[PDB]
Design a protein around this ligand. Structure first.
Ligand SMILES: Nc1ncnc2c1ncn2[C@@H]1O[C@H](COP(=O)(O)OP(=O)(O)O)[C@@H](O)[C@H]1O
Ligand SMILES: [Mg+2]
Length: 379
């Protein structure tokens, strides 16, 4: 089998190391460590911000894992995707803290009072995480933000609070006072780059797949599909997606009776979770850019290899041109076509020296659509 340990691919797996998150984990340690060792002398609070898949939840889980046996605090994890209103959240806090509810229906204030009484009378210390807190109404978020400041009612600073959002809107939608408590304890998780995605995936492959079933080039292909090139490219950089594609590709290969992941397993897996290549964006390419994309498609079909060289594509492109009765454009022109296809997300390139891959669309179907379009233009 290719897949030797599938738990290494589930959402809940917490890897041994978190490459590229050493800084955020350190920051968290700095905000929380003293209080976890000796709680109740000040109110620790942080806000973790970053797009989906930038390691916010995993980083926080790793922090807990390091302190789990070295603290009296209770880790009360609240997934804001699931528990959104006051009643749902206080109920999950109460369950996590074993606080029995009364027979009578309680008001919002009664509930908070009950939670304060239990924290105080049982001398408890809660590390409360409100994950994906953009899901809550701002008034709920403020209630919990303000609770940790009430040391005289609590008896100590009994609450350390981490809240998690995608961007600054989770804080900006708070009233000014409330915003005052959390601002400047902000830890930012930027979209992962291609190289960082690769390092994450290599760890997963080493832990979860058979030795020799995956190559560095295959992981690089998936990282080229998912990693952010520049940090403002916030629609990429998602490690969840990258790991999901790796696992889907390993399984596709295995189910087909193969021992090694091939480029087509990645393309098909990528298309199940991502937008593939738009026919609309193909139609608009100039003729020779279509022919050059057809050429890259033909070389990659022949190579069975994630990447082909620019020289390969150009030799393929001369053959393609003569088939379709066209004279081939010159090297520098092909170079600009490659630049444009890369800018549009149609192809991915990496330096060796230039390597080209098509990771987002199965080649048999791309090849058919591009051929159709060329045939129509040359009809
Ligand atoms: N730096 C990393 N190293 C290893 N695995 C990571 C890293 N960052 C994220 N992951 C994995 O990527 C996936 C998404 O991470 P996650 O913490 O769930 O993201 P977020 O809350 O930012 O949306 C999970 O499977 C997580 O374990
Ligand atoms: Mg998360």
């Amino acid at each position: 089998a290719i897949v030797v340990d599938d738990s290494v691919f589930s959402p809940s797996y917490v890897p041994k190391r978190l490459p590229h998150r050493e800084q955020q984990l350190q920051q968290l340690d700095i905000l929380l460590g003293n209080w976890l060792r000796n709680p109740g002398h000040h109110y620790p609070r942080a806000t973790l911000l970053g797009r989906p898949g930038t390691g916010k939840t995993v980083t926080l889980r790793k922090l807990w894992e390091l302190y789990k046996d070295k603290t009296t605090a209770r880790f009360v994890y609240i997934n804001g995707f699931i528990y959104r209103n006051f009643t749902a959240i206080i109920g999950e806090i109460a369950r996590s803290l074993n606080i029995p509810f009364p027979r009578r229906g309680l008001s919002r204030d009664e509930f908070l009072a009950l939670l304060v009484e239990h924290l105080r009378e049982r001398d408890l210390y809660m590390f409360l995480v409100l994950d994906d807190a953009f899901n809550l109404a701002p008034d709920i978020l403020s209630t919990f933000i303000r609770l940790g400041q009430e040391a005289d009612k609590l008896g100590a600073f009994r609450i350390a609070l981490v809240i998690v959002g995608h961007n600054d809107a989770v804080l900006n939608n708070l009233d000014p006072s409330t915003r005052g408590i959390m601002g400047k304890y902000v830890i930012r998780f930027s979209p992962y780059t291609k190289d960082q995605i690769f390092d994450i995936l290599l760890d997963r492959a080493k832990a979860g797949l058979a030795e020799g079933s995956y190559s560095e080039d295959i992981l690089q292909m998936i990282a080229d599909i998912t990693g952010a090139q520049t940090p403002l490219d916030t629609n990429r950089g998602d490690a969840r997606l990258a790991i999901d594609i790796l696992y889907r590709s390993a399984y596709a290969a295995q189910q087909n009776g193969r021992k090694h992941i091939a480029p087509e397993d990645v393309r098909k897996s990528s298309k199940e979770v991502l937008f593939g290549i738009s026919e609309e964006v193909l139609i608009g390419l100039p003729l020779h850019e279509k022919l050059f994309l057809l050429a890259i498609v033909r070389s990659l079909k022949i190579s069975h290899t994630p990447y082909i060289t620019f020289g390969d594509a150009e030799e393929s492109y001369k053959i393609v041109c003569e088939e379709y009765g066209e004279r081939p454009r010159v090297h520098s022109q092909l170079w600009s076509y490659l630049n444009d296809l890369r800018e549009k997300g149609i192809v991915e390139t990496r330096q060796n020296t230039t390597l080209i891959s098509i990771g987002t669309e199965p080649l048999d179907t791309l090849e058919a659509v591009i051929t159709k379009l060329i045939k129509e233009e040359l009809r």
